[PDB]
Amino acid sequence: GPVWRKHYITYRINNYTPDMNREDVDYAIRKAFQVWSNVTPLKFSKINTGMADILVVFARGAHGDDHAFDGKGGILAHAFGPGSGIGGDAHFDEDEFWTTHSGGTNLFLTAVHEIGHSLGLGHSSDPKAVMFPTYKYVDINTFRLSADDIRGIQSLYGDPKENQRLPNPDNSEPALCDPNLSFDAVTTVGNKIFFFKDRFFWLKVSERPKTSVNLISSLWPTLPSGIEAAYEIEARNQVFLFKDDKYWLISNLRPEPNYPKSIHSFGFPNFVKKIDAAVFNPRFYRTYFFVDNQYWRYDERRQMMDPGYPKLITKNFQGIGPKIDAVFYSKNKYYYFFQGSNQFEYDFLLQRITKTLKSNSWFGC
Ligand SMILES: [Ca+2]
Ligand SMILES: [Ca+2]
Ligand SMILES: [Ca+2]
Ligand SMILES: [Ca+2]
Ligand SMILES: [Zn+2]
Ligand SMILES: [Zn+2]
């Protein structure tokens, strides 16, 4: 079918069968989900309030749908492939008797078959599968995915995000996906992107599948670690490294005749102690400087702030927080902003955040 266009996904257990022990269903379920995330790059979260994205429900005969139930047997659950609205809900025929055991009609086994569906999978012609529609009421903590089901879950989603399997996946540090990966500064230099962090820098996007973090003292000479702001000027091979009241010019990875130097000879007041984010716009020939609260634009081709400058980041850039960690230019009319573990696709052409993404996306985790 289609599939879920999100790494992280929600469920809410909507109501409880009185075949009960609430808590046993929390489990049977929480756990059903687990089955899937354990072979699979997803997470699952039981929120208790607001509108979850997978919905478990226990209703009977005619419930809502157009696709009614039928009583004791035959259909026991149906769930809805992904899709807003009622897209991924898993529903359960209350006229059965659900169990932690294998008297009655197991809700571990059915919850899991039917979460797939919710998920994307059709059936498995595969007998051995946690469903050959023909529920194999089997032992319970030892049980596991017929390799088959593993394929089309895997077809649809991967194999999991850094090592070798079933067994499941681990979760690193300094890392490509601690999802609270913030930035010192960041830029691209002609077709790569340098991502700064303390002594670290991770580099690229460019057809190179995957991000290799390294120390900054290896590519870089006359310069400190821990880098606050940066941009580029692709037509002159220049990367500009900013920290504290001083900056560094660069070429071809090589520090042109003189640095560091001051930031003030570039122009600002002495009221200004540090540049926080910076981005150069070739469309129109200007650099954007960001001082917590406010910003400044430098006319590159004249060496001259344009008139009227400091300014107010939010008044002029719609919704970008009053402090910004990193900006950088998209080879075609955007700036991508990095405020916290957050980053914004920002169309500068009609000013509007248009995509909000995980601070760490081009490590397409
Ligand atoms: Ca839903
Ligand atoms: Ca039924
Ligand atoms: Ca019942
Ligand atoms: Ca910064
Ligand atoms: Zn239904
Ligand atoms: Zn089914």
For residue 224, give the CATH number of its domain.
2.110.10.10
198 is in an annotated binding site: no
- Resolution, rounded to a tenth of an Å? 3.0
Distances (CA, A) of 139 to 19, 32, 110, 167: 20, 14, 13, 20
Q: What are phi and psi of 215, to 5 degrees?
A: -85, 155
Question: Nearest bound ligand to CA 71?
Answer: 2
Cα distances from 84 to residues 13, 52, 81, 153, 237, in angstroms, run: 17, 11, 10, 20, 47
What separation in Å is there between the alpha carbon of 195 and the centre of ligand 4?
A: 11
Distance CA 44, CA 195 (A): 30
> Contact, 38 vs 150, CB < 8 A?
no
φ, ψ for residue 339, nearest 5 deg: -115, 125
Q: Which value, in Å, is the radius of gyration of the alpha carbons in the chain?
A: 27
Residues 39 and 61: their CA atoms lie apart, in Å, by 34
How many A from CA of 118 to the centre of ligand 1?
A: 9
Supply angle C-alpha 9, 203, 285, rounded to 5: 100
Residue 281's contacts (CB-CB under 8 Å, 6 or more residues apart) are 287, 288, 329, 335, 348
Method: X-ray
The residue assigned the tokens 């400044």 is: 296
> What are the backbone angles phi and psi of residue 47, rounded to the nearest 5°?
-85, 155
CB contact at 8 A, 56 and 13: yes
Task: Report the relative pairing of strands 43-46 and 8-13 from DSSP bridges.
Answer: parallel
Residue 325 annotated in ligand binding:
yes
Residue 173 bears catalytic tag:
no
Residues 137 and 208 in one domain: no
Length of the chain: 365
CB-based contact 187:153 (threshold 8 Å): no
Residue pair 230/185 in contact by the 8 Å Cβ criterion: yes
Same domain, 178 and 203: yes
Q: Which ligand lies nearest the alpha carbon of 114?
A: 6
Three-class HEC string of the chain: CCCCCCCEEEEEECCCCCCCCHHHHHHHHHHHHHHHHCCCCCEEEECCCCCCCEEEEEECCCCCCCCCCCCCCCCCEEECCCCCCCCCCEEEECCCCEECCCCCEECCHHHHHHHHHHHCCCCCCCCCCCCCCCCCCCCCCCCCCCHHHHHHHHCCCCCCCCCCCCCCCCCCCCCCCCCCCCCCCEEECCCCEEEEECCEEEECCCCCCCCCEEEHHHHCCCCCCCCCEEEEEHHHCEEEEEECCEEEECECCECCCCCCEECCCCCCCCCCCCCCEEEEECCCCEEEEEECCEEEEEECCCCEECCCCCCCHHHHCCCCCCCCCEEEEECCCEEEEEECCEEEEEECCCCEEEEEEECCCCCCC
Task: Output the CA torsion sign for 282, 353, 274, 312.
Answer: positive
Q: Are residues 137 and 196 in the same domain?
A: no
The answer to whether 89 is a known ligand-binding residue is: yes
Taking the alpha carbons at both ends of the chain, their separation in whole angstroms is: 24
By the 10 Å C-beta count (0-12 exposed, 13-18 middle, 19+ buried), 317 is classed as: buried
Question: Rounded CA gap, 59 and 345, in Å?
Answer: 42
- How many Å lie between the centroid of ligand 2 and the Cα of residue 97? 10
Same domain, residue pair 124 and 182: no
- Whether residue 80 contacts residue 87, with contact meaning beta carbons closer than 8 Å, is answered with yes
Give residue 17 CA to ligand 2 midpoint distance, Å.
Answer: 14
Same domain, 140 and 263: no
Nearest ligand to the CA atom of 93: 2
Residue finishing a domain among 172, 192, 211: 172
Calpha distance 192→196 (Å, rounded):
13
Helical axes 147-154 vs 109-119, angle rounded to 10°: 30
Within this chain, do residues 228 and 301 fall inside the same structural domain, yes or no? yes
Residue 123 annotated in ligand binding: yes
**352 and 241, same domain (yes or no):** yes
Tokens of 274: 């540090």
C-alpha distance from residue 177 to each of 119, 201, 232 (Å)? 24, 14, 26
Specify the CATH number for the domain of residue 68.
3.40.390.10
Cα–Cα distance measured from residue 157 to residue 119, given in angstroms and rounded to the nearest whole number: 10
The range of the structural domain enclosing residue 314 comes to 173-365
CA angle 70, 146, 55 (to 5 degrees): 45
Distance 131 CA to ligand 5 centre (A): 19
321 with 195, same domain: the answer is yes
In degrees and rounded to multiples of 5, residue 161 shows phi and psi of: -50, 35
Task: Single out the residue of 260, 240, 242, 261 nearest to residue 250, CA to CA.
Answer: 240
Residues 230 and 177 in one domain: yes
CB neighbour list of residue 1: distance below 8 Å, 6 or more residues apart: 81, 82, 120, 122
Contact status, residue 211 vs residue 197, Cβ threshold 8 Å: no
Q: Is 63 flagged in the annotation as binding?
A: yes
Residue with tokens 């004249």: 302
Number of domains in the chain: 2
Last residue of a domain, one of 172, 205, 220: 172
| Residue 308 assigned to a binding site | no
Claim to verify: residue 264 and residue 310 sit in the same structural domain: yes
Q: Are 94 and 58 in contact (CB under 8 A)?
A: yes
Q: From the CA of 47, how far away is ligand 1's center (Å)?
A: 13
CA neighbor of 286 nearest in space, from 267, 306, 266: 306
Residues 162 and 177 occupy one common structural domain: no
Looking at the structure, do residues 245 and 293 belong to the same domain, yes or no? yes
Query: Among 155, 172, 189, which residue terminates a domain?
Result: 172
Tell me the CA–centroid distance for residue 83 and ligand 1, in Å: 7
- The bound ligand whose nearest atom lies closest to the alpha carbon of 275 is 4
Q: How far apart are CA 90 and CA 356, in angstroms?
A: 29
Identify residue 96 by its one-letter amino acid code.
E
Residue 233 marked in a binding site: no
Distance separating alpha carbons of residues 173 and 177, to the nearest angstrom: 8
Report how far residue 161's alpha carbon sits from residue 329's, in angstroms, rounded to the nearest whole number: 29
What distance in Å separates the CA atoms of residue 295 and residue 350, rounded to the nearest whole number? 19
**Which residue, among 221, 222, 223, has the nearest Cα to 185 in the 3D structure?**
223
